[PDB]
Design a protein around this ligand. Structure first.
Ligand SMILES: OC[C@H]1O[C@](CO)(OC[C@@]2(OC[C@H]3O[C@@](CO)(OC[C@H]4O[C@@](CO)(OC[C@H]5O[C@@](CO)(OC[C@H]6O[C@@](CO)(OC[C@H]7O[C@](O)(CO)[C@@H](O)[C@@H]7O)[C@@H](O)[C@@H]6O)[C@@H](O)[C@@H]5O)[C@@H](O)[C@@H]4O)[C@@H](O)[C@@H]3O)O[C@H](CO[C@]3(CO)O[C@H](CO[C@]4(CO)O[C@H](CO[C@]5(CO)O[C@H](CO[C@]6(CO)O[C@H](CO[C@]7(CO)O[C@H](CO[C@]8(CO)O[C@H](CO)[C@@H](O)[C@@H]8O)[C@@H](O)[C@@H]7O)[C@@H](O)[C@@H]6O)[C@@H](O)[C@@H]5O)[C@@H](O)[C@@H]4O)[C@@H](O)[C@@H]3O)[C@@H](O)[C@@H]2O)[C@@H](O)[C@@H]1O
Ligand SMILES: OC[C@H]1O[C@@](CO)(OC[C@H]2O[C@@](CO)(OC[C@H]3O[C@@](CO)(OC[C@H]4O[C@@](CO)(OC[C@H]5O[C@](O)(CO)[C@@H](O)[C@@H]5O)[C@@H](O)[C@@H]4O)[C@@H](O)[C@@H]3O)[C@@H](O)[C@@H]2O)[C@@H](O)[C@@H]1O
Lengths: 63, 63, 435, 497
C-alpha cells in the first residue's frame, strides 16, 4: 500500500460545467461526486472510496 | 491551432473513454463533462497553461 | 510476572433486548440490533424493558430508560476493561417498490409520495399480454405476481404487504409515440385564467406542440395530475408589474413535488419571472435567485424601435439556437421583436460584475451557479442559462430576457418577421428537452 | 556536555523561532485547538468555566468536535477539566457538536448545557442541526438527555440552519433561549421561553438580521443601563465581530428590525479585526470578559490569511469589555494579564536607517525614517506613547524585523484614514486587513502590545483593540516606522515574564 494519489490530483481531475479544467479554483474545495463535473479519466487513474476497485463490483473501496 | 487540435484529440479520446464506467451515472451519480477546446486564436501563455493541465490530467500517477 | 492485570477475559455479547413489547434481532458481524415496529407506531418515547447482557457486563443504557429512537442509538457494553459498541435501529414496517419494468423498459417514473408509476412503453406492443417485473426493498409481498401477464389499458393497482404495513400503488403505461409535454399555469384552466401573456403562451403551445397538456398548481398539489407522466414542463410565470415578485403560495407548496419530479429526472423550461423558482427547486448551486429584476405594467408597455438582440458567442451549435432567421450574416447576433412593438421590461437575468453582485466574471458565475450561459445581453448579463443534470436529474432551460414575449398591446405580433424567433427558440427548446 | 548559549541580547539578525504545543496566557491545550468558546460563570465555585470545541488538523470525516472544559478565574491562568461532552456515533444526530450555551438551575442544583448536534450527511427528511441538552450535577460528569430534540423545522425555521443556542434568565424568572436560524430566506434570531428548561414555547422571533446576513453565537446581556447583543458575522467578506446597543430589551429588538441599520457607534459596531471570531461574553458580577479564538495560518505564514474566510479554531483569547459614557463598547486588556508582567527588560536601538534622532527616552521620526529595537521574548508587553504632528500621520509597528529580514509584518495606524491596517511589508508589500477606531483629538496614542508566543493583541489609547497571529515574532526584534507624517515616541518599556 504505497504510491497513494493525492487530493490535489483528484481536484485537478475535477472539471467545470463547460468541460474545461478549473485553472484557478480547482483546489479551493475537495471534489464532490454528487455536484461537481469530473473528467472520466479520474475513475481510470484514481480509485476513490465508495467506488469499485479496478472495475470490480466485489471490491468496493471504503474509507 | 495545430497544438490545440492535438489537445482536442486527446480530450475527445478521454470523453469517449467511458466503456467500463458508463453505469456510474446511475449507480453513484457521477457527472461526466469534458469537451474539446474551441478552435481559435490563443495566446502563448494560455496555450501553455492548457497544455500543462492536459498533461497533468492525462499522465497523472504515471511518474 | 508479565501480565498487566487488565482483566481482558470478560465477555461483552448482547443476547437480546426488548423495547416496549418488540424484541430485537442482533447481528454480531456489524454489531447491529434491529427492532421492527408497526408503521403507525410512535418511536419518539420508547421505553427499554429488558437487556440481557453477558455475565458481569454493564451497558450504557439502563433498564427502564426512556429514549427517542428516531435515529440509530449507540450502545457500549463494558466487561472489566473490554468494551464493544453496538448500534440500535428501530424500523417501522415499510413496503416500498423500488423498480418496475414492463418486460421491455426498465426506466419508469416512480414516486412513493403518491405511490404512482408512469411508464412510456410504446403502444405498438399489445397491451393485453404485458407482464410486469419489480424489485422491492425486502420481505414485501406484492399481490400481483411478479412477471405476470396482465392487461395495462386501465390503471393497474398493486398492493404491497409486509407484516403490519399495507400500501397501494397505481401503475399507468401510456404514450402515442409522442412524448407528452405539460404547461404549468397559476390556477384553474387555460380558458378561465388571468395573465393574457401566459394565456397566449399556453394557447400557442397547444396549437404548435403535438400532444401538449395543461396542469395547474392546485391540481399537482392535490394529486389530480402526476408530474412524472410528463417529461418536459414549461412555466412562463409573469407578474403584471413590480420587480422580484414573490412566487404564488400554491407554487411554494408544490415546490416539494416539483423538486421530487426534477430529481426523478423531468425536464424544465422556465421563462420570464419563473426564474426565482430555481432557488426553491435547488437547481442552482448558489441557491440564489437572479439578481436583476424589473417590471412594468402590461397596460402601458414601452414602445421602442431599438433592435434588442442576443449575443450568442460560443453557443451557436446549441440545438436551442437552430433554424433562426438572422437579419444578416452575423450569426452571433440574434434579433428579436425589433422596430416599434409592444415590449414590456419584464426581464430577469444575472449581472456579470463585482460591485453589487457576487458574479465578478463569467468563470465565477459559472462556478457558483453551476450552469452554462448560452446567451448574453450585450452588457455583461446572462439572459439564457442551461442547467445540466446533477444526479440523474432533469435539465433546466432558463430564459430571462425581455425579447421573449407572446402577447402585447400591439395587434398581430407575428407581423414583425423577427418575433418568429421566439416561437422558433421555444420549439427548439421543447424538442431539445424532449430528446 | 557543556551547553552553548547564543548572544540573544546584542544581535538583530532574524531568527527562526517556534511555537510550543501548549500556551499559558492565551490558552491552547497541548493537544488540539480551541474553537467557539462558551463562557460561563459558576455561582458555586465563583470562577469562569469556559468550554470550547477541540478541533484537530486531521478531523474525522463523520464524528468530531467534542467539548472540553477550561476553568479560570481571572482570564490569565487556565486549567483543563478534560473532555466534558463527547461526540456521538456516526449515525447519531450529535456526531458533530456545535456551539452552545450553559445555565445553572438552583431548582434542581443542575448545570444544563444546550448544544447543537450536526447530522453527518443528513437526508432530505432529516434535520441537519438539532438542539440537545446535557445535564451535570457537579459540572464534572455530563449525561445527555435522550428525550430532548428541539427540531428547527417544527416551528417553520430552516432545517439546515439552526445553531447557537444562547440561554439567559431575566428578572421575571423565565429563561429565554435565542437560536440563530433562517426563516423563508431571512436570518432570524428566534426566542424560546421556558420556566423549567424542560418544556419550551416559541415566543415568536426575537430579532431579524441585517441585510440577509448570518449571525454566529448571539449573546444578549445587560451592562449597567444598556442591552447589548454581541454576534459574529458569518459572511465571508466580513468575518468579524459586531454588536448592537439598546437602552431596553424593546429598543434592542427594535434595532435593525427591518433594514433599520441603527449602528451603535460611528464604526458600525466594530470590536476587533479578522483575527477574532466567535466572541462570547460572561460576567462575574463586577467585570465582563469576552472570549474568542485567534485563528491559525496555513503553512505558518502570517501573510497567508487565506481566501473567503480564514482557518477555523486557534488560540483562546480573552479580553475585557469596557463601557463608555455613551454606551459604546471597547475591548481592553484583562487586569490579571496586565499585572502578570513583572520583570522589565532594557531596550536599546539596534539599527539607524532613517533620519530619526535620539534625545534619551524620546525618539523623533520623520517620514521614511524607522528605528529597530532589541529582541523580544516568549511573553512580551511593549508599552509606549506616540505624539503625532497632526491627525493625518502614518506610523507603524513592525514585527519579525531584522537586519537581513526580507519581509516584516506591520500594523500601520493611519490617522488620515482613521483606522489601523495589518499588512506585510518587504519584498511583497501585501495588504492583509484593517480595523476602524476612534482617532484621538490630541494626536496622542498610548500603544500597548501584549504578545504570547505568536498571538499579539495591540491596544491603542483604550480605543482600539487589534488581535494578530504573527509567527516568528518571539525572540525577534521589533521596529517603529513612519511613512508620511512626523511622530515622537517615548516611554518605551518592555516587560517579560
Ligand atoms: O431592503 C431593501 C432591498 O434591498 C434588497 C435587500 O437585500 O436587496 C437588494 C440589494 O442589492 C444591492 C444592489 O442591487 C442594485 C444594484 O444597483 O440593484 C438590484 C435591483 O435593482 C434593479 C431593479 O430594476 O435594477 C437596478 C440595477 O440593475 C440595473 C442593470 O443591472 O438596472 C438596469 C436598468 O435598465 C432598464 C432600463 O431603464 O431596463 C433595461 C431594459 O433594457 C434591456 O437591457 C434590453 O431591452 C433589458 O435588460 C431591459 O428590458 C431598467 O428597467 C433597469 O432599471 C442597473 O442599471 C442597476 O444598478 C434590478 O437589477 C434588481 O432587482 C441596487 O438596487 C442595490 O443597490 O440592495 C440593498 C442595498 O444595500 C446596500 C447597497 O449596496 O448593500 C449593503 C449591504 O449588503 C452587503 C451584505 O449584506 O454589505 C456590503 C456593504 O455594506 C457595508 C456598508 O454598510 O460595506 C462594508 C464592507 O463592504 C465592502 C466589501 O467590498 O468593504 C469595502 C471597504 O473597503 C475597504 C475598507 O474596509 O478598503 C480597504 C482597502 O485598503 C486599502 C487599499 O489597499 O489599503 C491602503 C492602505 O491603507 C488604502 O488605500 C486602502 O484602505 C479594505 O480594508 C476594505 O475593502 C467596501 O467597498 C464594501 O462595501 C461593511 O461595513 C458593510 O457591510 C455589500 O457588499 C453587501 O451587499 C448596504 O450597505 C447597502 O445599503 C442590498 O442589501 C441588496 O444586496 C432586498 O432584500 C430589499 O428589498
Ligand atoms: O469539519 C469540516 C471543516 O470545517 C469546520 C469549520 O468549523 O467544521 C465545520 C463544522 O463545524 C460546525 C460544528 O462543528 O460549526 C462550527 C461552529 O463554529 C460556528 C461559529 O460559532 O460556526 C463557524 C463556522 O461555521 C462555517 C463553516 O462550518 O459555516 C457554517 C456552515 O454551516 C451551514 O449551515 C452549512 O449548511 C451553513 O450555514 C454554513 O456554510 C463557517 O461560516 C465558520 O467557519 C458555529 O456556527 C458552530 O457551532 C458545524 O456547523 C460545521 O459543520 C472545521 O471544524 C473543519 O475543519
Amino acid at each position: 500500500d504505497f504510491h497513494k494519489p493525492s487530493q490535489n490530483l483528484v481536484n485537478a481531475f475535477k472539471t467545470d460545467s463547460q468541460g474545461k479544467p478549473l485553472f484557478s479554483t480547482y483546489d479551493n474545495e475537495n471534489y464532490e461526486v454528487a455536484t461537481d463535473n469530473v473528467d472520466p479519466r479520474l475513475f481510470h487513474t484514481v480509485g476513490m472510496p465508495g467506488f469499485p476497485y479496478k472495475y470490480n463490483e466485489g471490491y468496493i473501496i471504503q474509507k | 491551432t495545430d497544438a490545440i487540435s492535438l489537445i482536442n484529440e486527446v480530450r475527445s479520446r478521454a470523453a469517449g473513454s467511458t466503456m467500463l464506467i458508463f453505469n456510474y451515472k446511475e449507480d453513484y451519480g457521477v457527472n461526466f463533462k469534458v469537451t474539446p477546446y474551441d478552435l481559435k486564436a490563443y495566446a502563448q501563455d494560455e496555450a501553455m497553461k492548457m497544455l500543462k493541465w492536459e498533461r497533468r490530467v492525462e499522465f497523472g500517477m504515471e511518474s | 510476572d508479565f501480565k498487566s492485570g487488565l482483566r481482558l477475559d470478560g465477555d461483552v455479547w448482547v443476547n437480546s433486548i426488548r423495547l416496549d413489547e418488540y424484541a430485537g434481532t442482533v447481528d454480531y458481524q456489524n454489531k447491529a440490533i434491529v427492532v421492527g415496529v408497526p408503521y403507525d407506531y410512535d418511536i419518539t418515547r420508547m421505553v427499554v424493558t429488558e437487556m440481557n447482557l453477558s455475565e458481569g457486563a454493564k451497558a450504557s443504557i439502563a433498564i427502564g430508560e426512556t429514549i427517542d429512537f428516531s435515529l440509530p442509538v449507540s450502545l457500549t457494553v463494558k466487561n472489566g476493561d473490554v468494551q464493544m459498541s453496538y448500534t440500535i435501529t428501530v424500523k417501522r414496517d415499510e413496503a416500498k417498490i423500488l423498480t418496475f419494468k414492463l418486460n421491455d423498459t426498465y426506466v419508469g417514473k416512480v414516486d412513493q409520495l403518491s405511490k404512482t408509476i408512469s411508464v412510456v412503453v410504446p403502444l405498438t406492443v399489445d397491451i393485453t399480454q404485458l407482464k410486469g417485473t419489480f424489485t422491492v426493498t425486502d420481505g414485501a409481498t406484492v399481490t400481483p405476481a411478479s412477471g405476470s401477464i396482465q392487461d395495462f389499458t386501465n390503471p393497474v393497482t398493486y398492493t404491497a404487504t409486509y407484516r403490519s404495513a399495507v400500501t397501494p400503488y397505481v401503475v399507468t403505461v401510456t404514450q402515442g409515440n409522442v412524448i407528452p409535454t405539460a404547461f404549468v399555469g397559476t390556477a384553474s384552466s387555460v380558458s378561465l385564467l388571468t395573465s393574457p401573456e401566459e394565456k397566449a403562451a399556453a394557447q400557442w403551445m397547444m396549437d404548435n406542440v403535438s400532444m401538449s397538456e395543461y396542469i395547474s398548481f392546485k391540481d399537482v398539489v392535490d394529486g389530480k395530475v402526476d408530474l412524472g407522466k410528463y417529461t418536459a414542463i414549461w412555466w412562463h410565470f409573469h407578474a403584471d408589474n413590480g420587480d422580484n415578485p414573490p412566487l404564488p403560495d400554491d407554487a411554494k407548496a408544490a415546490a416539494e413535488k416539483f423538486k421530487v419530479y426534477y430529481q426523478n429526472g423531468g425536464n424544465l423550461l422556465l421563462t420570464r419571472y419563473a426564474t426565482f423558482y430555481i432557488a426553491n427547486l435547488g437547481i442552482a448551486k448558489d441557491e440564489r435567485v437572479p439578481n436583476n429584476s424589473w417590471g412594468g405594467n402590461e397596460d402601458s408597455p414601452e414602445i421602442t424601435s431599438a433592435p434588442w438582440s442576443f449575443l450568442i458567442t460560443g453557443s451557436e451549435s446549441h440545438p436551442l439556437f437552430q433554424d433562426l432567421r438572422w437579419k444578416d450574416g452575423d450569426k452571433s447576433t440574434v434579433y428579436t421583436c425589433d422596430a416599434g412593438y409592444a415590449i414590456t421590461n419584464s426581464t430577469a437575468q444575472w449581472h456579470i460584475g463585482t460591485d453589487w453582485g457576487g458574479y465578478d466574471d463569467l468563470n465565477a458565475w459559472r462556478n457558483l451557479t453551476g450552469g452554462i450561459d448560452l446567451a448574453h445581453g450585450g452588457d455583461g448579463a446572462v439572459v439564457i442559462a442551461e442547467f445540466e443534470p446533477r444526479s440523474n436529474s432533469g435539465r433546466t432551460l432558463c430564459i430571462g430576457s425581455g425579447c421573449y414575449d407572446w402577447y402585447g398591446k400591439g395587434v398581430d405580433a407575428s407581423a414583425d418577421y423577427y418575433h418568429y424567433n421566439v416561437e422558433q427558440m421555444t420549439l427548439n427548446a421543447i424538442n431539445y428537452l424532449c430528446k | 556536555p557543556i551547553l552553548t548559549q547564543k548572544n540573544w541580547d546584542g544581535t538583530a539578525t532574524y531568527f527562526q523561532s517556534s511555537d510550543e504545543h501548549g500556551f499559558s496566557m492565551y490558552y491552547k491545550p497541548q493537544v488540539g485547538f480551541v474553537g467557539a468558546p462558551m463562557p460561563f460563570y459558576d455561582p458555586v465555585a465563583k470562577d469562569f468555566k469556559v468550554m470550547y470545541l477541540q478541533d484537530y488538523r486531521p478531523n474525522p470525516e463523520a464524528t468530531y468536535h467534542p467539548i472540553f472544559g477550561v476553568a479560570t478565574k481571572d482570564g490569565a491562568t487556565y486549567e483543563s477539566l478534560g473532555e466534558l461532552i463527547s461526540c456521538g456515533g456516526r449515525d447519531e444526530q450529535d456526531a458533530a457538536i456545535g456551539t452552545g450555551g450553559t445555565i445553572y438551575n438552583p431548582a434542581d442544583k443542575l448545570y444544563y448545557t444546550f448544544y447543537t448536534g450536526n447530522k453527518f450527511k443528513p437526508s432530505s427528511d432529516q434535520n441537519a442541526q438539532v438542539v440537545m441538552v446535557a445535564t451535570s450535577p457537579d459540572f464534572k460528569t455530563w449525561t445527555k438527555n435522550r428525550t430532548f430534540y428541539l427540531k428547527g423545522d417544527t416551528y417553520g425555521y430552516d432545517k439546515n440552519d439552526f445553531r447557537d443556542p444562547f440561554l439567559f434568565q431575566t428578572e421575571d424568572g423565565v429563561y429565554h433561549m435565542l437560536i440563530a436560524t433562517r426563516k423563508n430566506g431571512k436570518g432570524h434570531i428566534a426566542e424560546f421561553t421556558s420556566a423549567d428548561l424542560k418544556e419550551w414555547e416559541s415566543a415568536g422571533t426575537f430579532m431579524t438580521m441585517m441585510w440577509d446576513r448570518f449571525y454566529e453565537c448571539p449573546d444578549v446581556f445587560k451592562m449597567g443601563d444598556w442591552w447589548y447583543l454581541i454576534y459574529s458575522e458569518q459572511a465571508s467578506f466580513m468575518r468579524k465581530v459586531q454588536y448592537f446597543k439598546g437602552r431596553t430589551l424593546e429598543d434592542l429588538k427594535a434595532t435593525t428590525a427591518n433594514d433599520a441599520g441603527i449602528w451603535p457607534d460611528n464604526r458600525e459596531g466594530m470590536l476587533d479585526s479578522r483575527a477574532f471570531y466567535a466572541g462570547k461574553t460572561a460576567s462575574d458580577g463586577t467585570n465582563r470578559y469576552i472570549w474568542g479564538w485567534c485563528p491559525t495560518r496555513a503553512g505558518n505564514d502570517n501573510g497567508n490569511v487565506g481566501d473567503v474566510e480564514p482557518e477555523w479554531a486557534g488560540n483562546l483569547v480573552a479580553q475585557r469589555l469596557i463601557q463608555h459614557e455613551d454606551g459604546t463598547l471597547t475591548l481592553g486588556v484583562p487586569d490579571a494579564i496586565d499585572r502578570k508582567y513583572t520583570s522589565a527588560q532594557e531596550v536599546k536601538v539596534m539599527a539607524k536607517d532613517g533620519n530619526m534622532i535620539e534625545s534619551g527616552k524620546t525618539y523623533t521620526l520623520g517620514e521614511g525614517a524607522s528605528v529597530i529595537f532589541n529582541r523580544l521574548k516568549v511573553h512580551n508587553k511593549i508599552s509606549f506613547t506616540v505624539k503625532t504632528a497632526s491627525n493625518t500621520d502614518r506610523f507603524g509597528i513592525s514585527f519579525v524585523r531584522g537586519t537581513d529580514s526580507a519581509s516584516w509584518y506591520s500594523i500601520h495606524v493611519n490617522a488620515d484614514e482613521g483606522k489601523a491596517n495589518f499588512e506585510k511589508d518587504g519584498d511583497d508589500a501585501k495588504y492583509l486587513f484593517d480595523n476602524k477606531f476612534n482617532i484621538p483629538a490630541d494626536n496622542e496614542y498610548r500603544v500597548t502590545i501584549y504578545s504570547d508566543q505568536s498571538v499579539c493583541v495591540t491596544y491603542i489609547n483604550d480605543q482600539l483593540s487589534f488581535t494578530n497571529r504573527i509567527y516568528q515574532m518571539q525572540k525577534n526584534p521589533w521596529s517603529l516606522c513612519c511613512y508620511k507624517g512626523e511622530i515622537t515616541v517615548s516611554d518605551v518599556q518592555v516587560s517579560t515574564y
